Each structure stands twice: as C-alpha cells, then as structure tokens.
Write a protein that binds this ligand. Structure first.
Ligand code: AZA
Ligand code: AZA
Ligand code: AZA
Ligand code: AZA
Ligand code: CL
Ligand code: CL
Ligand code: CL
Ligand code: CL
Ligand code: CL
Ligand code: CL
Ligand code: CL
Ligand code: CL
Ligand code: CL
Ligand code: CL
Lengths: 298, 303, 297, 297
C-alpha cells in the first residue's frame, strides 16, 4: 500500500535546454559576435508540482529562457563564464524557492574572416577546433563555483607513443608496442572554485595551450607516451603547474587505434604506410586531479 | 604558486577510470530450425587499486581494454545471454574474482531492438526487423567487498498525448509571458532507470516488461477517457508512483522527461482559422524535468 | 567573365524540414498525422541570380505558409494526396514555376493500446521503417507520384550465402553458403499518373511484399545467393502482387556479421558470437520498370 | 510477372566509407592524409540480380582491398589523383565494369603549431569545410574529375537584405535591407578532362574565391540583395579567377537569425540578441558552365 509516507524524494531538477542565440555588438562599422548555447537547471525548496499537482512555486522553463535572453541583451557577454555567473546570481538573488542553480554554456566557434592579412569588419567562418564551454553552479548559502572546459578536441600524433609492460592473462592477445598512432578525442573540465581575480578568456587560452603542448611535446622531437593514461597525467600536471587558478582538472581521453593493415595476402608490404582507424569498440580513460591545499581547505 | 611545478605530493587523485566502450555483438542460439538472437552494445569500466599508469608511467597492473573486449565476447559464448542483467552480473563477477587489481567494475548493456517477423500470425524461424519503441538497458556495478547493484531502464522512449494536459497556477514575475493552458499536446522523450539493489528473486525480462507497461499506462491514463496532467512534473510523479505501487522489486526509480511544445500556428494573416488543427513542434530550446524516488525502508537500510 | 560566357545549367530553391502535426477529432477519439515536408521550385527565369532582381521569386517563407494552409484546409488523408495538392497549388497559382517537387515523410506515431483497447489520444514513436512519398511535375507534364519506405532494417540469421564470384589477385573473400543477411533498405516505387486506388492500402501491401520476399516462408525461409538476388526477389514480388507499381528502386546497405575467431582465447565459436562491421559497408541498388509503362513513353 | 515483362533501368553496387590514413615520413617530419572513400561500379550485365549468377561480381571486399593497395603503392599526392588512379585501375583491370565512380573526402587534420613552429608529427582536427573530389568514367567515355568543399558555414552580420520579391495572399515576409546572412555551402566544380595543374593549389584558389565573394572587401563588405545573388557572386568570382573550372554548382542552406521581440519583457532589442531558426530552412542551388566547354560537346 505505497503512499508519499513510504517514499523519499532523493532529487528533483528541471530547466531549459539548448537556448541558442547570438549577441551582436557594433563599434561603428566593426561587428563582434558571441553565439552561445545555454542550459539552465533549478532545484526548488519544495516538490508540490510533483507530489500534489500544485505549480504555485514553479518558475516556467519559458521564464528561464526569457531571463537568459534579457540578461544577454542588458549585460552583453564579455565571457561565457561571466554570463553563467550572472544567470546563477539572478536566480539566487531573485527566487527564494530556488535551492540550487546550474548554468552550462558552450560557444559556437565563429572566427572573423581575413582577406590578405586584413580582418573583415562583419564576416565570420565556423572553425570547430574544440568546443569552449563553462559551467557555474550554486547551492543556496553555498559558494558560486565556476568550471571551464574544452570538449570534442581531437588530437593525433603519428609516433612517440607505445603501450608495453601491461598485465597479461589467458584472455590477453594485445602485443607490446613502442610505436603506434596516438589519436584521442578529449573532454577537459577544470574548476576555478570561487576565484575570479583574472581574465576568463586569457586563462581559458592558457589552459588550451597547456593541453596541446603536453599532448604533443616539443615540435622538433616530441615526447614518448607509454600509455593513454600517462598522456592524460602529463596534460593535467602541465595545466596544474602553469595555471594556479585551476584547483581541480578532469580529463577524458577516448582513443582510436589505427591498425597497420596486414597486406601480405594482397602481395604487398605495409611498413606503417596505410593505417585503418577502429572507431568502435574504443578505449577510454578518465582522471580527476585536485590540489591537496584546495580540498583540505573545505 | 610558490612552486615552479606541482608534484605527486601536492595533488590528490579524486577519480581514475578506464574501459572499453561500444562492444557490439550478436549472440545466436538455435533450437533446431528456430533461431533466437540477442544483439547488444556493452561498455565495461574498471577502477584499479593504484594509479601508477597515470602517476609513474608504469603499466604493470593495467588490464588492456582489448582484454576487457575479449572477456565480454568469451563470456557471451560460454554463458549465453538469458537476460542483459544476468550478463552484466556475470561480467562484473568475472572481473572481481579474476583480477585482484580491480577495485571497482561497472557494466552498461543496451539491446538492439530486433523483433521476430510474423506472416499471417506465424512467427518466422530466422527473420527479424529492427523496431525501436524504446531502448532497453541495464547497469551492474560493484566495489570490491561491496554489494553487486543492478539497475534496468528504458531510454529514447517518445510518448505523446494530444489532450488531457495543461500547465496553470505557476509562479508569475516580470519575465513570465507563458499563458495558462488547460489543453496542450504533452510530448515527452523519457529516460527511466530503476534499481533492484541486490535483489534477484525474479525473472529480469518479465519485471522489465511490467515496468514498461506501468510507464505507458501512467503516461496515457485509461484508454476510454485518459487522465488530466497538470504539469510535466506531475506526469513524471504518476509514472514513478505507478511503478512503485505495482512492482515491489523496484527500490529506486529515476525518470527524466524532455518535452517538445506543439504550438497552434497563428494563421489569421493567411486568411484562415486554426482551431488546434495544425501544430508545429519546438525541438529547441526544450524543457526537462527529472525526479528520483526511493523507498524509505531501502534507503534507511544502508548505513 | 560575363553573363555572355556562362550558361545557367540548373537553378532550384525551396523550403526544407517543414514539420507540423495535423490533428483530427471524432468526438473523444483523436487522429494524428505528423509530417516533415520539403518543397522545391525551379522558376522560368534566373533574374534573382543573374541581375539581383527578386520580382518573380516566391519567398521560401511563402512556400512554408502554403504547405501549412493546405494542411489546415484540405486535411491529410494520405501524404501522397497532400504532396499532389501542394504540387497542383504551385502549378495552377504561379506561371513563373517551371517545376515543383514535394518530398514528405511521416513521423511514425502509433496509437497506444492497453489490454487490446486502443487509446483515444495517446501515441508512441515506433520507427520500423519511415514512410515517405515524392510528387514532382514539370510545367504541363505529368504529375508523378512515388511512395517509399526507408531506414527499414531487416536481418535473417541463415539461408544466405555469396559464392561463385569473380576472383583476382586482390580477392581474399572466402566463399560462404551460411552467413547473417542484415540489410538497411531504401525502397521507392512510382505509380506514375495512376490514382485509381487507396494510397495507404497499397503502401501497406508493398511493405508486406518487401518483408515476405526478404524472409521467404516462415517455416523454412528461402536461400539468398547474394544481396543483389535478394533485391531482385523483393522487386519481382512487389511487381507480381501490386499492379499499380510501374517502377521500383531498391537500395540494400548491408552489414557483415563476422564469427569472432576465439582460438587464441582457448575456445570454439560455432556461429554463436558475431560482431557486426558497420564501416566500411557494401551497397547494391537496382531500378526495375514494366516494359509496358516505359514503352508507353 | 517474369524477366520478359521487366527492364533493368539501373544496377549499381560498391563499397562505402573506406576509412584509412596514409602516413609519409621525411626523416623526423611526418605527413598524414586521412580519407573516406566510396567506390561504385555498374557491370555490363545483371546476372547476379536476374539469375543468381555471381560469375562477374567483384566482391565489395575486393574494392576495399584495391583502394588500400593503391594508397600503399602510389601514395596520395592529392585526393583527385587518387580518385583518378582508382577509376583507371577498375577500367583497365575489369572488362565487366561499364562505369566506375570514386568519391573521396579528407579528414581535416591540421599540423599543430607552437608559436609559429610546425610540429614534426602532431595534428589537430579542424573542420572549417570538408574537402572532397569525385572521379567517374563510362567505358570508352572521358574520365571526369570534380573537386569541392562542403559543410562550409559562413556568416556576415550585415550587408544583406531581401526586397522586391513576388507578393500574393500567402506572403507575410516583410521587406528587409538589414539581416544576418548565414549559409552552409556545398560547392562542387568540374575540371572536365583537363589535368595540366596542381590540384591542391587550384582547390585553395577556389576556396579563397568563395570566402572573398561571400564577404566582399574587409573595410566595407558588399550588399547582397538575396541568397541567390550571393551564390551567383561566388560562382562568377570562381569562373573569373580560375580558368581550370569549367562548371560550378553551389548550394546555400540558410539559417534566418530573428531579432527577438522583447517588448513583453520590458526591453528594447536593437539587433542585439538574435535567435537562429534551424528548421524549417531555405536552400538555393545553381549550376553555371562556360559556353565554350558545353558547346565543345
Ligand atoms: O595506452 C593504452 N592504455 C590502455 O589501457 C590500453 N588498452 N589497450 N591498449 C591500451 N593502450
Ligand atoms: O508542465 C510544465 N512544466 C514546466 O516546468 C513548464 N515550463 N514551461 N512550461 C511548462 N510546463
Ligand atoms: O552478396 C554479396 N554481394 C556482393 O556484392 C558482395 N561483396 N562482398 N560480399 C558480398 N556479398
Ligand atoms: O534571399 C532570400 N531568398 C529567398 O528565396 C527567400 N525566401 N525567403 N527569404 C528569402 N531570402
Ligand atoms: Cl578567413
Ligand atoms: Cl601500431
Ligand atoms: Cl598546489
Ligand atoms: Cl513483421
Ligand atoms: Cl502501446
Ligand atoms: Cl545456422
Ligand atoms: Cl559467416
Ligand atoms: Cl508487366
Ligand atoms: Cl595548434
Ligand atoms: Cl532582420
């Protein structure tokens, strides 16, 4: 005889997803664009809309959309991180029924066109070299926490990669390799915690450079990777060493193996000339590192 | 910093996880001329008892993701697949009993929805058609020395009712332009996931089917009149309470409803009168709501 | 380089992915037809391209408005009749239209049932092959109607092989008399100008022919010596059983299911565990027409 | 219904999505060309379909093997030359082949740079337009080569309108002399049989013409009176500046950006916040050819 008495609400969450818009800014003839996709989710201090059919405290998801568009118009978007902070602060300062707010934003990667070294006043091209995103979240009476990241970042090096000295058992057929293609799709996300004493765009760029440089090694010789997992650690340690603002960094590496096609039966000798990617199944590894000092201090 | 560099000393590993994703295969079973298929997609992830592969470049304890794939295929061949839940349990148990360096294993499985073809009510011995009316999945996970926990679910389940839906009496402020509505199309894409915890005294396929029926029936109401929904959130609660009322084996149920609004096109400027005849779906932006309900007795009984 | 040096070989424009649901009520009982419509025009002039002169251009926005107005005024008895109505509207209304093509696909909503009782107003999405149609007309030429089914995925676990094929120095494929036959089908058939029949009944009849020819009889099935032969069996079955079909195109995109070699893993895979190859993939395509219909042009 | 009553209008088969990377080393410096290849054949007979006789069928598996062997033996100087090599191989090797078509697209790997210094062996995926080419040949006919760029998304925030279009009772679109012009481009051009040039240099030249004609000069831009006129400006720019292009097809799929009405929200939106409409969407397409090239057939 199952009633509300027997049942606990563990979690209730709602929001508006994929709010797409472009913020246009004009300085005379020169146009500036920031196109974004925004998700904003709320947890309310009550669940009457679920438990009783009573919508009294529910802010319509339509109103969440309107608030995002109004703030874009009124505040502009200097950085997606500042815009995410503004949205979270709006919900927390305005609505007592909001226990928690989270805003996710990703940039549409528009770049200004150039003709013969001259930047175009109002013409752009889509150049996805890794999607910039950020995330702000706040519990009522808790810290406002900001994360930034880069996803759908596909990096490949054609050498200075192996995987040797791994655990062997009766189901292990993988050969030892000291030369292979290292191809990874990266999801990288880092927390600034509460710190905001810096330029969000400059620090995002600095973290991106650390990820590319740690992945590749120096351009004249590169650097040997003994595993996907070690490359993830090199990226994380490089970011933490060079960017003090990063408190916690998560890196997910989804890899594609490139197989040297055996062409003996086709009367041919394939000396790492023709390689076929395996898209599925695929390996993943994931690590989150945090500074001892930041975790201790809570 | 006051250091030119962080070292292992300054850093904590909060999480390390690796695995094999999208292991696709079909398990074929023959009873004379009659063929039976189970095609699945499997993901298996491990956490090891150390992170030396990350911290030191030492792969001694790393089970190749290739070996994870080989083990999944061997177990499919040796054990068969009576249910994806039993197969996920078998995979988790294999990793825990075989590899001392495994601290944690998680197996996710989804079924390719093959249905046997029929001609004039007669089942075909060996011919199938793909019919995605909601993707069946399950998830098993175990910490070393902890419970083996099994969840089942259905995702990409798209349900629509053309009436008996409104949203009224919501909070109003200066940015609220949404009108009150007591008649609209309720169109939802559902993700539903439920925990059996450690309980296994039942047929996984029969109970999965029972939960699916509860979801469709609670969404729709009775076939002769339906049932009024005063919000997406209330419909989620009706689905959850229906499952919890009718299926004692479900301890915890999560439901996510991603909705599409269908707008009655204003056709006045085109010289005609649209009386809820032509409606245009809004795919983005879209609303979502999510609720997880659990039995007090099951949650209490854990620590 | 000027207008003088250049020929316009082709000019075409239109509105894509017009999505809407047409709701019809018979008391408490609701009926839905949700569709995605594309409508394309060729104009008798290209001044909008060649001179920057939009005088004859029907805005793509107007194409959308016309599709929605016709849905409201006429209803949708069948997507084929709706595609005919759209093509006729553009041809009879706009002298600047040289050519119109309307593509329509159905969102595959099915009415929910509880204990064998149909629900008055509740539906579930069941994509077991997308129904579509295409109507096209050149100015004062025939209005031609095609219907079809795409994203139709059929699989049989035996009664399939591929043997006796051409061998050369780059041919490693073994002969096989037992394999899984798994195909994603695109099927499209022309009624030409004929309209003396129920579009929904004939569509259903063609779908049944495709499933039955693919599968063979349910007690024993039927051996397929190639993907290409299975395509021919489907086409000949449709042409035999559905006189209204004049021309039928079938595309079969196949997935090979490989019996995993498990010798190195210390066991024996007797066609028990098979791994699908999604890419690269084989395709074959055939279009058959009735002599009578082709001759009579 | 038998073979007697039916004509085969078309038979075609092939291998789709052959993915591989061709690696080339000059000491420490690595060069990559990763491609996706489709190769389709029409055979001189249809016995595999009509009779269940596979004697002349080249397995699609052999098509894959041939593509990989040619990549290994010849390298890939350009995807156009590789597509030519594949077509020539099938025509010279197999007398049962009536027709061959090879489609190739590049995976857009770019070499990584650190402060202007190229990395010897490290790359990043940067899809700013997918490069493709297509070669086709009928037995005893010319080997024809086309090159192109697709999924090219360009946007300008002004110097775009659409005015003076045809009005009727279903036309609600207002006249506009200022709007965002946002287009996803598919561009494809024919060299015909001509091959007296560097395929990579000419591809780059055509890409620059497309960007420059779309944008106009960087200090003022150039007014577009329609999507259709912008397509014409791109085509005429390519034809003016690249003599090797004989025929050019351009498809523009547009997204309208709507200035959100914010009056009800107590706000004044002066082209500050714009929401893109992804569906439905307008398209226009034009193919232009040189008189000289078309006449000379
Ligand atoms: O670097 C690697 N890490 C792994 O865990 C793995 N498994 N197979 N190959 C691999 N390579
Ligand atoms: O049922 C509804 N719940 C919501 O939270 C909501 N927001 N806008 N419309 C809505 N409808
Ligand atoms: O039935 C088949 N037809 C083909 O053309 C083919 N090519 N490889 N395998 C094949 N199987
Ligand atoms: O430039 C344009 N061309 C068209 O054909 C059109 N239709 N609506 N808007 C349009 N804009
Ligand atoms: Cl540029
Ligand atoms: Cl290798
Ligand atoms: Cl530190
Ligand atoms: Cl069936
Ligand atoms: Cl049902
Ligand atoms: Cl068998
Ligand atoms: Cl086989
Ligand atoms: Cl006939
Ligand atoms: Cl770079
Ligand atoms: Cl505008």
């Amino acid at each position: 005889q199952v009633t509300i008495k027997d049942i606990e609400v563990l979690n209730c969450e709602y929001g508006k997803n994929t709010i797409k818009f472009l913020r246009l800014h004009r300085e005379g003839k020169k146009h500036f664009v920031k196109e974004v996709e925004v998700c904003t989710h709320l947890r309310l201090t009550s669940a009457h809309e679920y438990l009783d059919g009573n919508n009294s405290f529910v802010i319509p998801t339509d109103t969440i959309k309107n608030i995002v568009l109004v703030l874009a118009k009124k505040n502009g978007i200097s950085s997606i991180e500042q815009f995410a902070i503004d949205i979270c602060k709006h919900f927390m300062t305005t609505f007592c029924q909001v226990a928690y707010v989270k805003t996710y934003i990703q940039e549409v990667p528009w770049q200004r066109q150039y003709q013969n070294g001259v930047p175009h006043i109002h013409s752009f091209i889509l150049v996805p070299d890794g999607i910039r995103f950020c995330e702000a979240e706040q519990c009522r009476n808790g810290p406002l926490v900001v994360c930034a990241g880069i996803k759908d970042l596909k990096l490949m090096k054609t050498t200075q990669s192996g995987f040797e000295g791994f655990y062997r058992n009766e189901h292990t057929t993988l050969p030892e390799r000291n030369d292979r293609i290292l191809c990874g799709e990266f999801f990288c996300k880092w927390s600034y915690g509460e710190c905001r004493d810096f330029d969000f765009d400059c620090i995002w760029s600095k973290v991106r450079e650390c990820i590319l440089e740690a992945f590749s090694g120096p351009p004249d010789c590169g650097e040997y990777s003994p595993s996907y997992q070690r490359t993830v650690n090199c990226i994380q340690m490089c970011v933490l060493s060079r960017v003090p603002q990063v408190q916690v960094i998560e890196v997910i590496l989804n890899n594609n193996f490139y197989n040297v096609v055996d062409m003996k039966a086709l009367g041919c000798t394939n000396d790492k000339e023709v390689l076929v990617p395996v898209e599925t199944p695929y390996g993943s590894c994931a690590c989150t590192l945090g500074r001892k000092k930041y975790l201790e201090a809570q």
